[PDB]
Design a protein around this ligand. Structure first.
Ligand SMILES: CC(C)CCC[C@@H](C)[C@H]1CC[C@H]2[C@@H]3CC=C4C[C@@H](O)CC[C@]4(C)[C@H]3CC[C@]12C
Ligand SMILES: CC(C)CCC[C@@H](C)[C@H]1CC[C@H]2[C@@H]3CC=C4C[C@@H](O)CC[C@]4(C)[C@H]3CC[C@]12C
Ligand SMILES: CC(C)CCC[C@@H](C)[C@H]1CC[C@H]2[C@@H]3CC=C4C[C@@H](O)CC[C@]4(C)[C@H]3CC[C@]12C
Lengths: 1074, 34
């Protein structure tokens, strides 16, 4: 369909307005003949489709008196219709100029020129301005640019051809249609009488300058020069002229480009006027020994050989134009394959860009697009050596913001190495001040990170705009689900940090202090280091949020608290890969491979812990008990449990930290029986034990009874005394009145119900407490004791109510002794057997679902077959469901079946009354073959395959339950269970500190700054040692060595081909010298 | 074996760079001799 609306850019350059196609293209005019001066408005514009081309290039016929800024606005409106309003702006205008006739090149120089032009068009997104015809230099530029059109997706570089209308074949066919011509076919083989030069088929745009003449060339040179000057004025881009062969008109074009300030790159080895300009640049600028023999008379003889003028004054004017074209050494850049190299054409384009109109930040942006960091490093060292460090440091902010924009982390490390603070970032546009003080306290680097979030969110199919639109949060970061603050400042970094704290966990939170960024704290020691740490953490969280791995590695390496930030990263990238805001096919591989990158951070985090376990176990235990102040004073193993990293929690150094968090961090009593002997005799063991006056022994006893192992063995001893005293209650006979042991059981389970209600209501929440298995077993033993005690206490004198009370309390016996198995998770040899039994219970339920078929079928058939003449009752159903079971487990009741069958023979099934009654054996025979030889041994094979499947996963789940049991018993009350309600009375004393008295005094231990600086230097030394060892291990792999020697063979084969070409040139010079 | 042939490729690339520098010096001496 033809487009009726086009987005034309405004005169301010900050917006685009939709208009009609005829109303925008009425400013483009045309001339029907040479006598017409004002002419008609143009009716020949639209889309022309070439043969063997999938797309139709837009053509526009414009007048010679029309302005080139309207043609550049029409090209920008065509690019806005092609690739949306957020199209790629060009950074280079490559003016391909040279011979309009056919010019055969050597294949090494044409391959190097086409590879440099394709690499500059792929990297810089450059606009190619050529002649547009399919003959010679413009056809070679179209053959260079057609390889970039197929190998690169998304936005393509446009190849604009500016050509005269009267020489273009098919312009009368282009002028014979109602505009816009949507896909009109261009016939290059059509015989046009007055125009014989067809257009190039690989040119992606056409500008046909119409002065009304026919078969005239050179009428569109000044219009293409004004279009290149208008594009360099509009996009703030340098214009570079590529020159290959060429005539005297190309020499006058290069002389007018050198007079206009445009730098020109001449490719030597292309012959003609380009070799004459290369010989003039060799005689005028090059002091080499091959260029020492070049003379003005030899260059005049080469100009008479190539151009061949009719007069000697024209040869003197051509030699003067070749001298004045190569008079400026900055404006002429000579590229040779025998001098520069094969991969030096884009370096010659970058050298012409550095030798162009020189802004320093635009040269660093063009070097960051061209990706030659040694060129920008030598230019920054030359700018620092010339005393221009203030102009370098003024332009390093926008170059560094473009370096995080275009994702070049070696340039990020280059600008970070060139004396620039990472907390000295300022945005490109000014931020409007809101009435909220949280945005008023945000510094300029937070506005720079919010500018990079708004720049990354302006791309189409962006996952961050779908992340914000599915966030349902406020601009302060609260999830309560003003609109100008929700449109302009919606990507503020406090709201992003609250979305990241929600995206790690439900209870995860971060803490950022901007009050060290004031100028009054500049004299504080280490405030600049904490400023670089907070800015590296914010740019680190932005680097995960843009999923760039190497920039996140660089901000992880220059940041502090590396292990905690790597765990938080790996959790938020592994959860953000499997998220509904990243659903969609176009964000497919960024779904996948970033999850791959997420596993990379998990492996990275383990190795820094391994580097800590390479260095010192005691410094690693001092590392992992340190509470980071940016994450609400949480230790790193709680960050691992909230981050759910099972690979980090199964490490033995983390298990050394968790077993140091057991036993009160006391290195004397570590055995179970030694802790039981210390708990049974406290006064006779704890002075005699090793350490961690009377106040020191009281502090040692207070360190002993605040251990989680001591509270765990107190809860185990209280549960053992509970189960033994309820065993002595339920086995002994209940009296006619209420006994004192029933009052002790009532007070004991009343304290257990008060501790269960204190764990349910005031501690965690109802949905967290209902998800636990053992809390539900505790609730059903509370309900079983209260049902049996209400059945006893409804009628204490009835013996039948005592029978109902013991039959209700047998469930309490079975569930209480089964709840004694929940203390076996602290043992090393019992806990994975419990997790393997809980994995194996699905195979148990599969065996029950297999055996119920055989049991119900043989039970109904067997009980119907031994009793033919019997009415149905309950006892027939008990006779179905009873005996078959116990015939699986071994008691094959047989005499009782011979007595039930009423068979009177001396043989055990003979002389029976019913003749069909001696088939109960045969059904019993096939039942015990189906049960005791088929299904139970299928369990055996299912348990062997089940245990050999999930043994290591049961071990890693035991490590997660080990830190979950240590965190559960660290927050346990210090008293055991029948004292615990009295300890809840002490919690009621905390209620006396809460609201009425309000005299609560609490404090926390503050660590030393020297110990935290030693832990941070230990973290930086272990992280640098692990990244050096991991780079050596990545370089020491087999695949990297065979790929490195394959690239070195390919470079040695290129060096051998260059040495063979230099030896062939030396043999040709030795043949021509003779 | 793959580390020994990687070191031998690196030594052969250094010998090819020295042979290319000697051939460029011989071509510069043949240019200056004319
Ligand atoms: C091979 C099977 C699956 C097919 C069906 C066979 C059944 C219907 C047949 C095969 C042999 C038969 C038995 C053979 C002989 C007698 C003795 C007679 O005094 C009473 C019936 C009784 C006890 C038959 C009952 C039915 C019986 C069990
Ligand atoms: C079902 C497949 C596996 C084989 C079928 C075997 C069945 C039909 C056969 C095998 C042995 C047979 C029994 C062998 C002997 C006797 C004793 C006779 O006084 C009555 C029939 C009776 C009780 C038969 C009933 C049918 C019987 C149970
Ligand atoms: C290797 C295994 C399969 C051994 C074979 C077992 C079979 C053939 C045996 C085991 C028990 C046997 C039964 C035992 C008792 C009786 C009752 C009798 O009045 C008729 C035969 C009958 C019903 C037998 C039939 C054959 C029998 C079912």
């Amino acid at each position: 369909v033809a487009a009726k609306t086009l987005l034309i850019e405004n005169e301010d350059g900050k917006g685009s307005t939709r208009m009609e196609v005829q109303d925008f293209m009425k400013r483009f005019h045309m001339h029907a003949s040479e006598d017409d001066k004002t002419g008609s408005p143009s009716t020949a514009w639209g889309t022309l489709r070439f043969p063997t081309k999938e797309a139709t290039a837009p053509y526009l016929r414009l007048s010679v008196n029309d302005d080139p800024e309207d043609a550049l606005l029409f090209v920008k409106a065509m690019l806005a219709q092609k690739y949306g309003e957020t199209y790629d702006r060009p950074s280079l205008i490559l003016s391909v100029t040279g011979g309009a006739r056919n010019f055969t090149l050597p294949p090494r120089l044409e391959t190097a020129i086409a590879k440099g032009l394709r690499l500059a068009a792929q990297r810089t997104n450059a606009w190619v301005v050529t002649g547009g015809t399919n003959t010679g230099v413009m056809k070679l530029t179209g053959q260079i640019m057609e390889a970039l059109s197929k190998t690169q997706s998304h936005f393509i570089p446009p190849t604009i051809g500016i050509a005269t209308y009267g020489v273009i074949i098919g312009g009368d066919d282009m002028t014979r249609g109602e505009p816009p011509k949507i896909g009109l076919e261009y016939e290059m083989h059509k015989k046009d009488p007055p125009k014989t030069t067809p257009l190039d088929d690989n040119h992606n745009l056409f500008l046909l300058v119409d002065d009304g003449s026919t078969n005239k060339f050179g009428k569109e040179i000044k219009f293409r020069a004004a279009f290149e000057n208008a594009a360099g004025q509009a996009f703030a881009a340098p214009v570079v002229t590529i020159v290959v062969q060429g005539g005297p008109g190309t020499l006058g074009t290069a002389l007018q480009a050198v007079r206009q300030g445009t730098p020109i790159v001449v490719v030597d080895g292309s012959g003609l006027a380009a070799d004459v300009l290369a010989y003039a640049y060799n005689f005028m600028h090059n002091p080499l020994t091959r260029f020492k023999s070049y003379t003005i008379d030899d260059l005049r003889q080469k100009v008479a050989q190539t151009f061949n003028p009719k007069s000697s004054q024209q040869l003197t004017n051509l030699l003067d134009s070749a001298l004045e074209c190569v008079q400026d050494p900055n404006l002429v850049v000579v590229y040779s394959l025998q001098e520069s190299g094969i991969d030096e054409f884009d370096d010659c384009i970058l050298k012409a860009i550095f030798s162009s109109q020189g802004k320093l930040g635009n040269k660093l942006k063009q070097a960051m697009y061209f990706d030659q960091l040694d060129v920008a490093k030598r230019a920054l060292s030359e700018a620092s050596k010339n005393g221009q460090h203030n102009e370098i440091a003024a332009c390093i902010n926008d170059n560094l913001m473009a370096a995080m924009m275009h994702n070049k982390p070696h340039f990020v490390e280059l600008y970070l190495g060139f004396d620039a603070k990472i907390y000295e970032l300022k945005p490109s546009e000014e931020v409007a001040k809101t009435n909220i003080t949280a945005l008023d306290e945000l510094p300029s680097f937070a506005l720079a990170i919010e500018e990079l979030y708004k720049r990354e969110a302006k791309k189409p199919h962006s996952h961050v705009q779908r992340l914000v639109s599915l966030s349902n949060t406020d601009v302060l970061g609260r999830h309560y689900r003003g609109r100008d603050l929700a449109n302009t400042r919606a990507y503020n970094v406090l709201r992003m940090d609250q979305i990241f704290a929600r995206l790690v966990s439900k209870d995860f939170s971060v803490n950022r202090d901007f009050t060290i960024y004031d100028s009054k704290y500049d004299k504080v020691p280490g405030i600049q280091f904490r400023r670089t740490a907070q800015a590296s953490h914010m740019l680190f969280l932005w680097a995960i949020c843009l999923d760039r791995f190497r920039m996140a590695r660089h901000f992880w390496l220059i940041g502090d608290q590396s292990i905690i930030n790597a765990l938080v990263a790996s959790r938020i990238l592994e959860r953000l890969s499997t998220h509904r805001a990243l659903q969609g096919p176009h964000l497919a591989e960024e779904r996948a491979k970033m999850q791959h990158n997420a596993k990379k951070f998990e492996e990275l985090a383990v190795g820094v812990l391994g580097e800590c376990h390479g260095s010192d176990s005691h410094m690693a235990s001092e590392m992992l008990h340190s509470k980071n102040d940016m994450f609400n004073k949480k230790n790193a193993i709680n960050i691992a449990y909230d981050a759910k990293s099972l690979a980090f929690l199964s490490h033995p150094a983390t298990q050394s930290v968790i077993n140091a968090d057991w036993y009160g961090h006391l290195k004397s009593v570590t055995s179970f029986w030694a802790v039981l002997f210390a708990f049974f005799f406290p006064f006779f063991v704890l002075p005699f034990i090793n350490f961690s006056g009377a106040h020191r022994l009281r502090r040692k006893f207070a360190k002993f009874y605040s251990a989680p192992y001591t509270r765990f063995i107190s809860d185990l001893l209280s549960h053992f005394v509970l189960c033994v005293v309820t065993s002595y209650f339920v086995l002994d006979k209940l009296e006619d009145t209420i006994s004192a042991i029933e009052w002790i059981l009532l007070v004991w389970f009343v304290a257990l119900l008060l501790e269960e209600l204190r764990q349910m209501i005031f501690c965690d929440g109802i949905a967290e407490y209902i998800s636990d298995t053992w809390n539900r077993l505790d609730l059903i033993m509370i309900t079983l004791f209260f049902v049996g005690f209400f059945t006893h206490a409804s009628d204490p004198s009835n013996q039948d109510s005592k029978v109902v009370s013991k039959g209700i309390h047998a469930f309490l016996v079975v569930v209480l002794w089964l709840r004694f198995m929940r203390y076996y998770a602290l043992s090393k040899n019992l806990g994975p057997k419990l997790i393997m039994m809980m994995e194996m219970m699905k195979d148990v339920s599969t065996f029950v679902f297999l055996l119920l078929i055989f049991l119900i079928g043989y039970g109904v058939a067997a009980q119907s077959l031994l009793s033919p003449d019997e009415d149905f009752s309950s006892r027939t159903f008990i006779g179905v469901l009873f005996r078959p079971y116990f015939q699986i487990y071994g008691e094959l009741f047989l005499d009782d079946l011979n007595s039930e069958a009423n068979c009177l023979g001396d043989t055990p099934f003979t002389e029976c009354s019913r003749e069909t009654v001696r088939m109960v054996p045969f059904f019993l025979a096939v039942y015990i073959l189906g049960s005791n030889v088929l299904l139970v041994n299928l369990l055996i094979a299912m348990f062997n395959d089940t245990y050999m499947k999930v043994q290591e996963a049961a071990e890693d789940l035991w490590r997660k339950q080990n830190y979950e049991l240590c965190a559960e018993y660290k927050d346990r009350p210090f008293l055991p269970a029948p004292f615990i309600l009295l300890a809840h009375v002490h919690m009621l004393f905390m209620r006396l500190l809460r609201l009425c008295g309000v005299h609560t005094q609490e404090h926390e231990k503050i660590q030393d700054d020297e110990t935290k600086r030693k832990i941070t230097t230990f973290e930086e030394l272990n992280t640098d040692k692990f990244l050096r060892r991991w780079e050596r291990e990545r370089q020491e792999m087999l695949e990297a060595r065979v790929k490195m020697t394959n690239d070195n063979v390919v470079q040695a084969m290129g060096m051998m081909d260059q040495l063979l070409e230099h030896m062939i040139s030396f043999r040709f010079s030795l043949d021509q010298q003779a």
